[PDB]
Design a protein around this nucleic acid. Sequence first.
RNA 1: GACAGAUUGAUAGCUCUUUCUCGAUUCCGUGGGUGGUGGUGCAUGGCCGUUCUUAGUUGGUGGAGCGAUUUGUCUGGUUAAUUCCGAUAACGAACGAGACUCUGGCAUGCUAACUAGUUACGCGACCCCCGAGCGGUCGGCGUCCCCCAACUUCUUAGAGGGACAAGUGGCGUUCAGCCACCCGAGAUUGAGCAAUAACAGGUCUGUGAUGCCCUUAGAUGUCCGGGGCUGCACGCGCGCUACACUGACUGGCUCAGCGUGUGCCUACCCUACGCCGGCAGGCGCGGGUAACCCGUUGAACCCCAUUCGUGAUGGGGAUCGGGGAUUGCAAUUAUUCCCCAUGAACGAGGAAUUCCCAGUAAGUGCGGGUCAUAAGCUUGCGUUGAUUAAGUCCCUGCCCUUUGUACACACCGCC
Lengths: 52, 70, 227, 98, 141, 65, 104
Amino acid sequence: GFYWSHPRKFGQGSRSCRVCSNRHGLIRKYGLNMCRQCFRQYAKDIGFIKLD
Amino acid sequence: HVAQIYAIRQSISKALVAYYQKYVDEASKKEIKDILIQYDRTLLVADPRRCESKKFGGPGARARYQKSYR
Amino acid sequence: MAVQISKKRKFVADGIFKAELNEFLTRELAEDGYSGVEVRVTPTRTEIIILATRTQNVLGEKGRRIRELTAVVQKRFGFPEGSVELYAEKVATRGLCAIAQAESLRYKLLGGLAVRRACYGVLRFIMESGAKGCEVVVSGKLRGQRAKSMKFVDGLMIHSGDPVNYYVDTAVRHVLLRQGVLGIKVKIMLPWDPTGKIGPKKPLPDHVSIVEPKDEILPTTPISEQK
Amino acid sequence: MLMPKKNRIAIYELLFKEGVMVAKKDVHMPKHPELADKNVPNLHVMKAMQSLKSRGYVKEQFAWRHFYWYLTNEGIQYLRDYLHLPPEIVPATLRRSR
Amino acid sequence: VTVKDVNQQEFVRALAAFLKKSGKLKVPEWVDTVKLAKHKELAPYDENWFYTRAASTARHLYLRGGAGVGSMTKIYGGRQRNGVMPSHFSRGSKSVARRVLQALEGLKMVEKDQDGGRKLTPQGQRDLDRIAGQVAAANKK
Amino acid sequence: MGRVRTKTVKKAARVIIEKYYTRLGNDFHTNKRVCEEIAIIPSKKLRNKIAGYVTHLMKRIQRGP
Amino acid sequence: AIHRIRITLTSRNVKSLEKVCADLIRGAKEKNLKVKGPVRMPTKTLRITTRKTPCGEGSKTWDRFQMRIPKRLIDLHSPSEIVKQITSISIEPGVEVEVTIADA
RNA sequence: GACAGAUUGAUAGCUCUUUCUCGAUUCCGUGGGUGGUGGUGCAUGGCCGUUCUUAGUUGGUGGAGCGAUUUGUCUGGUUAAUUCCGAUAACGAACGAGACUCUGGCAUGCUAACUAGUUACGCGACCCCCGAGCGGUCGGCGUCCCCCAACUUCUUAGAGGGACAAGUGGCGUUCAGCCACCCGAGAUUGAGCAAUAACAGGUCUGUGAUGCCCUUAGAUGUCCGGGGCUGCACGCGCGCUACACUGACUGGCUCAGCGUGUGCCUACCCUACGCCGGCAGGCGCGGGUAACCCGUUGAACCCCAUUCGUGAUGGGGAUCGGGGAUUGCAAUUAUUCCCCAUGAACGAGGAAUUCCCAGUAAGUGCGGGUCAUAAGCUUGCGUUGAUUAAGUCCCUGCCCUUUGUACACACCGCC
């Protein structure tokens, strides 16, 4: 067990979607780390309700 | 900057109005309120207005990011 | 430990934990008609009421399955030994929950059946149960290389407003078949408008109920009385 | 009956010790909560357990990238006979109820 | 007739004069070659800012109970063409507001407050607004 | 222009009056909260909006039936 | 004991927070002591703005995902009974309750 | 499963001798997978886009048609809106609109609030002439606060109320309403939600949603190193900055709001105040699950103080010369920033064409999102805040009705 090495510490190497491990359009804010779609799926359940 | 002034204008006309009303008299309150509201400039009247929100697909409230078009 | 995670970043986290559950739970207690958890945090403890239907399967061998899921949630979201008790309960009037019936239709098709006779069997039921109205949509390829979309509807249904938000019981579920993939969409209308017990708002705001004259008898000559 | 012996013999006996073994799908952990005498992340765990299911002596869920390894009644034999463990054994689901 | 009662912009005009006509403060050397803030395009014409800016800074402290260097930088701002770019806000120079504070400290117009930040000291509190009397009573105009 | 009335109002209004001619009058704010008593009008807008014709039909009635 | 207790009530549901908030006032005033009633902080609006579209295309429409979080808090002075009574009762929905010891 | 060299990029036993250990793993077939940001969005789920915030759609019973179908579902007035009334073989219903939610504004009306403000006190003070004043006295920032003041005047957020074409005068079939005026927010402050029914719209690269297909170890499995995605005679698309003197650079004064922040799922912030340095910055140290700390968020336009003189000039400010910082293991392929230095076209834009009516256009920063590094991107937020339409269908495109139609892949047709 050796070699699989870089900065996996910053850069999107590191961070990915908690639901589906895709690595774009990522809701970093507010300690979510969902992909932007994985919001609208896991959104009502979270608490973000569309008001206005 | 500017707002702060019809704010302070409105305030020292309103305050002065509540002055002559509450303890002093009413006739002078009404002679004041007349002298003011014959030309308002929103002196005792709060300007009911406030800014619109922005909507997506535009720089301001209403206007829109220019349409590409072939 | 001395983090004190933020009333911004914390309710987000418990919304997330909520979601993470309601998925594995859905995806594992599927054949048993999981309707929904309501997460029940307490002193020293985190209750979590698994509101599903056929509780003979959530218990299993003398109550094994319940004990697996308890251990799972212990081992995942960080709940120490004796700090999490699952509590499987049977759903009241399962006709009126959506995902119960929508799942009942993933598995009625999966089992091996036509669309037609099945979804009627659902739609029939959910109305007969006690619904203001309902609809079911079975989009997807359906005995043909092309995709159809089928929609069998019954009773009343509001299709706009805030009202929708606390009245309809929407539920999407896929279904993966020996061919490909259909969509179920069950969308039930709740008649808790009549009698929740205190049905939330009760009126659909359109609807006013004028209580009637009731008495208003007698003009007559004057008279008096004493007591 | 495979791979790094020290690590994988410990993964079996972890799973026999427990009713359920959760995980995460992440090759780059060098650890895993409880056990992990040494390294043995996903890989050594997965490689073992994704063997166990396919032959049949364990059963899955997945649920938001994690692997929901639940121990099968047939596996009770496979792993205790792997681990020479006593013919009573009692894995973990002893389960005093009421 | 406090700093407020005097029409505040012809305050620092005379307070710049004060500290010139004192002939002490501690003018230094980065001076003739100073930018003033990366903010600006060009070094300032009145060759004598800091008599007039230490004036500002010192009266400023009169108006506000405590102020750091970080504060002084903040307050003397502006827009900043990064050019074809849009304009943004850049803090003023620290060095200069700092040495203005430290130099005001030499005459003892100011002092370091408790809880961080400079405020003006009673002695300075005087020299400041003494001339407020002299600016109102220079003449009514 | 903005406001012509909806049939939830026009119908309920006309039906209050059919049933409480004696209770109502030709003011707003009186019969306004009569409607709170004799009906279950959920929204304040509608509650209030209903006393709309409740008046516009009394102004009609005195003039004609 | 009598110590300077703060109860900080943080929740999302305004109605299901102010049934609890009222029950602490009416729970303390039963066994009267002191209070300084419910304080009302600014409500924090957790506002996210993502594209409606998965993938690219269509005229650019986004949603406006919101979560509120109103904080009430109630000061009091009591022993280790009245705290452990008033906190454990009036729990239930999605409501978080803090208990500060005293002053800091 | 292999510590010195041939090598190789690599301290890759990945490989060419040597061999020293774990030791039942290993290896080699076969079938079969397992992935794949491979393929196919005319194999599909969901989700989205849109026809289309346009007024439309549907049924029960009647009535008409043998029956597809049709009326109800409409001449006219009305209306943002088959929305309403009424004429009425229809009567009374259902979805869309409306009602609703959020929001935005009147609430010296209530409940309160050391995580708001506080307010003004009481002003008890420090208090320096901060300033007025001979002195009493006063104007005023700051503080000394605290508090066992007092209170909600603004702040906050809970319950409330209200605004409802409500009154009066026109106009109107004198109905439905429309118009004007009164009190006053005059019936419209702005979104979200949005039907039937569609469309090879888009999406397999948001989905551990996935049909089938490919590919499958030399692997399109996962990566390291580099490279590219940035390349350049030309073409178009959204932006910004200018063209200057109602302006340019030179003093100064001075007014927020929505947010945002550490200590977060795997290594990582927000930043107050000390020195140092010009500056980038650097180096000191401080508060901060936050309405406390940043933070009276001390901004730009704006506002005020001097230069300049209509010079492609001081606008403009490109393209390069050279330094210096910072992020990053690493910036070559100017990373980002600063400091120098060069110092462009543009003096209002040829053919066209979108945007919109009130706190609106425009300017103007500022947050958020994107972020190690970082935005000329969007989405919000105030702030400064105009001109003008207040109507029409003249162009474009939409609704109904009647009608014609050899069109029904519907005129981008048919011939």
